[PDB]
Design a protein around this ligand. Structure first.
Ligand code: I24
Ligand code: I24
Ligand code: DGL
Ligand code: DGL
Lengths: 269, 266
């Protein structure tokens, strides 16, 4: 632009995720931060990250972060709970721009909303094995009881378009019975895909349990940071994928309500 | 950073915010100042509230606090920007976190806020919300009788319930799905307000949201207390009667034998 580069605050916020699931976080940014320009990258060619070794996830997440940094983003959001669980500390420490992940904001919202100090979190194998949630919660409130439960079947339920089905209900109930002795009043949906399962999880957990949406809370934290440092955009979005642009578009355009949404396939390896 | 978080308010009402900090931030040491001798701020001119708020901030600054929370919505409405710009420590108020929470929770894009005359006159809520998410319709309503109801201690009475119903009658009609409790005192009225608005209106507690934000900021600025109990007690200061402050605070916070000191400002 004639100015040279864009004004710092006019640059995009970047979001990285293992695929299309992270569009639950992006959709929250469209809602809560409509003035911001967004650049999204999903590593669909290597999804899922859930079951992968931490070292692989850190590598792949760095490749995504490096790609978006070159696009002059003013802030990076690691939209993926699995990537946040193992990669956030290192990436945050290494970059000069704000870096936020999706675990801490959910943890803090859970501490805020709990009344009985019994909190659960569900997520991928990798997320839960990292113990990141237990650490994020107990760093601030060490006496809270935290129960962490991997739900590996949940991502595939959403991917197969069965997230409203009888099968979904049976699988969720079968898995979540592992929580039932813990007296929880709060459950963190610690995975990008779980908002699509929210009504099923709520039915299983009942009316006394408050569910926490990772993207919703993380986007609220982004909003806070933008305002605090006066770097909000003054009153198109870009989509990148390592898989098929068309297959990305079919999920995204409708999910997000952007009719002429075009995605671009890129290579990271 | 082992130094205290400071909280300032026009009186004892801001202990609704402090109570949230005890719950969400139990590792942190707190210093609270309430300007009881000049409470209420609600009906005062902006300029006067700014001066008083500066006096409070300056008093806690001398106590080596690492962060300042303006717990009072009325004070936040007029004084936050200038105090934040001037001080060498982070400063947070109670308005923006409520505004952000309301943007997050609304589904129908119809949000209300209630507060003192001062808070509502400032238009801080409307400005904050419209600068972030301008699709939202914001209804702002001053509720001048509410602080007196809570100050009277008779905030669960038939008289109180009638006044809340009368005051919010027009607001009930707006089809809101979210209502910000934009005043330190209003958590005390929350069940009555929820009964009047209906179970489908999500109420936003300023203090609860603000402390959640403080928690995130302590980690972001890398100034959180170590994960253990502090070694020095919380401290409580008032420009009114310490005896009265103690009686209210010990009961409300569940800290028996809490002690406060009376200080002078201005
Ligand atoms: C926004 C959450 C996305 C959840 O994640 C996700 N991933 C898919 N596919 C994964 C592999 N694809 C990805 C695209 O590149 C090629 C390979 C889905 N297919 C149907 N639905 C179900 C579905 C849908 F079909 C539309 C909207 C939402 C949704 F969950 C899917 N949801
Ligand atoms: C912060 C909420 C505190 C609510 O709790 C509380 N406790 C009190 N006293 C302690 C209870 N004792 C009193 C003597 O008999 C035995 C019990 C109060 N006195 C006035 N206000 C009312 C009041 C108020 F609720 C807010 C601000 C100012 C105020 F006076 C009080 N509110
Ligand atoms: N995006 C991942 C879910 C899919 C995956 O396993 O990569 C998460 O949020 O945990
Ligand atoms: N603390 C004030 C209410 C009491 C007053 O009017 O000073 C507020 O939050 O608006």
């Amino acid at each position: 632009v004639p100015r040279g580069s864009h004004m710092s605050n006019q640059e995009a916020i970047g979001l990285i995720d293992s695929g299309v699931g992270g569009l639950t976080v992006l959709k929250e940014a469209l809602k809560q931060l409509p003035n911001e320009r967004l650049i999204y990258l999903g590593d669909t060619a290597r999804c899922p990250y859930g079951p992968r070794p931490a070292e692989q996830v850190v590598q792949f997440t760095w490749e995504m972060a490096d790609f978006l940094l070159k696009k002059r983003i003013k802030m990076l959001v690691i939209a993926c709970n699995t990537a946040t669980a193992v990669a956030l500390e290192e990436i945050k420490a290494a970059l000069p721009i704000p870096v936020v992940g999706v675990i801490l904001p959910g943890a803090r919202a859970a501490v805020k909303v709990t009344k009985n100090n019994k909190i659960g979190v569900i997520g991928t194998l990798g997320t839960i094995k990292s113990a990141s949630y237990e650490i994020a919660i107990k760093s601030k409130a060490p006496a809270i009881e935290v129960t962490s439960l991997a739900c590996p079947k949940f991502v595939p339920i959403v991917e197969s378009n069965q997230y409203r089905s009888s099968v979904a209900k049976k699988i969720v109930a079968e898995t979540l019975q592992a929580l039932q002795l813990k007296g929880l009043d709060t459950l963190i949906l610690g995975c990008t895909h779980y908002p699509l399962l929210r009504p099923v999880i709520q039915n299983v957990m009942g009316s006394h349990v408050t569910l926490i949406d990772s993207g919703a809370e993380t986007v609220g934290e982004v909003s806070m940071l933008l305002d605090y440092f006066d770097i909000a955009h003054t009153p198109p979005h870009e989509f990148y994928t390592t898989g098929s642009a068309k297959m990305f578009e079919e999920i995204a355009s409708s999910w997000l309500g952007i009719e002429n949404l075009k995605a671009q396939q890129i290579h990271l390896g």
